[PDB]
């Protein structure tokens, strides 16, 4: 059946190539003959798929339909670009038939206990449908787009059941991967709707996005229940990043309604992530706890940048509040690290945070947002105080090397911040930094004293 498939697959491809020649030349008589030949090959291929399924080879069965569908979409593209509605009609009907077959192959795969293949089939199909949707969107074919958007919905429902299956199989990893990929594809489809200005499609997708998010949060819950806080974190981190990417599309397009929905989704993810951080701390994994908050903070600053550049004070407000909450958590993680006797990690957390705060400060300085800059400069001060206590700890631990490294890095970062103040002409910030610089110098000189006393 393998060879049988290969023959028909190659033939079909060659027929489509011949069809292209007929389409471009405008030879309807040849195109007719070829389109009839294409139909005959499809029927054969579907019987080969049947054979493969009867042989217990659902993998091959899937591959055949996947390739065929791709070729049909390629043929559809030719019809769309040429404006041949009759051919496009025939192909769109062929596409539907293949989809139905593929869904039965997915069913078979699930019955065989192969949820992995089942997922892969639907994931590929969905991607191909979105590609076909793009053709409909760009060409402005609402009838085709309608059909595809309905096909997309059906695939999503199947995928969610495959996610359910994966969870029932105890494979929360796969369950996550499916929803993560789907969400990404939905956002890509959303982008097409946003750029084209198709509010109806965007609506449908935004509803699909919401449904996926809810599923993902339950997968995160599952992961946490399985004692896999690492995966739980990864899921939310990826989701948050994707939400920010979607937010960017809303911000640039000026879609406040979508941005609202996403900003609410972002908030929900943050709350989950903070509970995962809590879990990690309860598990004695302060390292992961730190990494989660560090990544989140970076993503929040990136989102803040979008708000700052666009001039969205309402979003910036929300993010700046989220940033504050993360900072407080991070400082408690630093405390934890110090209590664990890990002054190294404690230092690294504050050093990274400070750098990120200075980066955020730069955005405030360049944009001229004194209110944000104020908040950040206060956050910077708080971090410095913590760092100096970590330096103290390091010295008490007999680690004058680390103590030095912390102050050296901090001083460098302060000078970088000073540069921003100097170039912008912000004497108030420069004053604060120059005072911070002095304090660090005094500490460093005491570390030098310590080093000398240690014979180093």
Interface positions with its own copies (CB under 8 A)? 1-4, 6-8, 10-11, 14, 17-18, 21-22, 25, 27, 30, 33, 37, 40-41, 44, 47-48, 51, 55, 400-401, 404, 407-408, 411-412, 415, 418-419, 422-423, 430, 434, 437-438, 441, 444-445, 447-449, 451-452, 454-456
3-state helix, strand, coil in the chain (%, to 5): 90, 0, 10
Determine the Cα–Cα distance for residues 384 and 346; give it in Å rounded to an integer: 12
**8 Å CB contact between 323 and 297:** yes
Kindly list the distances between the CA atom of residue 25 and the CA atoms of 21, 29, 30, 47, in Å, as whole numbers in the listed order: 6, 11, 10, 33
List CB contacts of 179: < 8 A, sequence separation 6 or more: 159, 163, 212, 215, 216, 219
Minimum CB–partner distance for residue 75 and its own copies (Å): 15
Of residues 132, 110, 133, 130, the one with CA closest to residue 121: 110
CB of 129 to its own copies, least distance (A): 28
For CA atoms 321, 324, 330, 335, give the dihedral sign. negative
The dihedral sign for the CA sequence 133, 139, 142, 144: negative
Find the helix packing angle between 115-139 and 58-82, rounded to 10°: 0
- Smallest distance, its own copies to C-beta of residue 24, A: 9
d(CA 52, CA 112): 14
Distance in angstroms (rounded) separating the CA atoms of residues 282 and 118: 37
* 89 vs 442 by CB, closer to its own copies: 442
- Our CB check for its own copies shows the closer of 57 and 114 to be 57
* Smaller CB separation from its own copies, 42 or 118: 42
CB of 447 to its own copies, least distance (A): 6
Q: Which is nearer to its own copies, 221 or 439 (CB)?
A: 439
Minimal distance, residue 6 CB to its own copies, in Å = 8
Q: How far is the CB of 402 from its own copies (least distance, A)?
A: 11
How distant, in Å, are the alpha carbons of 92, 358, 426 from that of 103?
A: 17, 52, 63
Q: Which is nearer to its own copies, 195 or 401 (CB)?
A: 401
8 Å CB contact between 438 and 402: no
Three-class SS of residue 401? helix
In the complex, the smallest distance separating the C-beta of residue 297 from its own copies, rounded to whole angstroms, is 26
Q: How far is the CB of 40 from its own copies (least distance, A)?
A: 7
Please, which residue, 143 or 397, has the CB nearer to its own copies? 397
CB of 361 to its own copies, least distance (A): 16
Q: Among residues 25 and 225, whose Cβ is nearest to its own copies?
A: 25
Q: Which is nearer to its own copies, 110 or 420 (CB)?
A: 420
Minimum CB separation of residue 47 from its own copies in Å reads: 8
CB nearer its own copies, residue 37 or residue 97:
37
Nearer to its own copies, 48 or 205 (CB): 48
Phi, psi of 303 (to 5 degrees): -65, -40
Side-chain half-sphere CA neighbours of 13 within 13 A: 9
CA atoms within 13 A on the CB side of 370: 6
Name the minimum Å distance from CB 238 to its own copies: 38
182 SS3 class? helix
Is residue 319 classed exposed, middle or buried when 0-12, 13-18 and 19+ CB atoms within 10 A define those classes?
A: buried
- Output 21 or 89, the one with its CB closest to its own copies: 21
Nearer to its own copies, 40 or 264 (CB): 40
Distances from the Cα of 339 to the Cα of 87, 174, 284, 313, angstroms: 71, 37, 11, 39
Q: Smallest distance from the beta carbon of 153 to its own copies, in angstroms?
A: 35
- Whole-angstrom Cα Rg for the chain: 29
């Amino acid at each position: 059946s393998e060879l049988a498939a290969r023959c028909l697959i190659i033939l079909f491809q060659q027929l489509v190539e011949l069809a292209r020649l007929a389409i471009e030349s405008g030879d309807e008589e040849l195109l007719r003959r070829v389109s009839e030949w294409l139909e005959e090959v499809i029927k054969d291929m579907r019987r080969v798929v049947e054979q493969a399924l009867r042989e217990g080879n659902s993998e091959l069965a899937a591959r055949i339909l996947i390739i065929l569908f791709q070729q049909l979409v390629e043929l559809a593209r030719l019809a769309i670009e040429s404006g041949d509605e009759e051919l496009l009609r025939r192909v769109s009907e062929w596409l539907e038939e293949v989809i139905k077959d593929m869904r039965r192959v997915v069913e078979q795969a699930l019955r065989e206990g192969n949820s992995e293949l089942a997922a892969r089939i639907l994931i590929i199909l969905f991607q191909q449908l979105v590609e076909l949707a793009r053709l409909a969107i760009e060409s402005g074919d609402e009838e085709l787009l309608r059909r595809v958007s309905e096909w997309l919905e059906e695939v999503i429902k199947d995928m969610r059941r495959v996610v359910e299956q994966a969870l029932r199989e105890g494979n929360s990893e796969l369950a996550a991967r499916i929803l993560i990929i789907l969400f990404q594809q939905l956002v890509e489809l959303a982008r097409l709707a946003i750029e084209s200005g198709d509010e109806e499609l965007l609506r449908r997708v935004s509803e699909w996005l919401e449904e996926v998010i809810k599923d993902m949060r339950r997968v995160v819950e599952q992961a946490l229940r399985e004692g896999n806080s690492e995966l739980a974190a990864r899921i939310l981190i990826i989701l948050f990043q994707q939400l920010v990417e979607l937010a960017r599309l809303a911000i640039e397009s000026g879609d406040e309604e979508l941005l609202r929905r996403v900003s609410e989704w972002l908030e929900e993810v943050i709350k989950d992530m903070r509970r995962v951080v809590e879990q990690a701390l309860r598990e004695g994994n302060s390292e992961l706890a730190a990494r989660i908050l560090i990544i989140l903070f970076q993503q929040l600053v990136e989102l803040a940048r979008l708000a700052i550049e666009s001039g969205d004070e309402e979003l910036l407000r929300r993010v700046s509040e989220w940033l504050e909450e993360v900072i407080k958590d991070m400082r408690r993680v630093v405390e934890q690290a110090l209590r664990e006797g890990n002054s190294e990690l404690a230092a690294r957390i504050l050093i990274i945070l400070f750098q990120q705060l200075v980066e955020l400060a730069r955005l405030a300085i360049e944009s001229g947002d004194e209110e944000l800059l104020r908040r950040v400069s206060e956050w910077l001060e708080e971090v410095i105080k913590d760092m100096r206590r970590v330096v103290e700890q390091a010295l008490r631990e007999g680690n004058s090397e680390l103590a030095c490294r912390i102050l050296i890095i901090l001083f460098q970062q302060l000078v970088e911040l000073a540069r921003l103040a100097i170039e912008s002409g912000d004497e108030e910030l420069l004053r604060r930094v120059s005072e911070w610089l002095e304090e660090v110098i005094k500490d460093m000189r005491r570390v030098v004293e310590q080093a000398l006393r240690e014979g180093n």
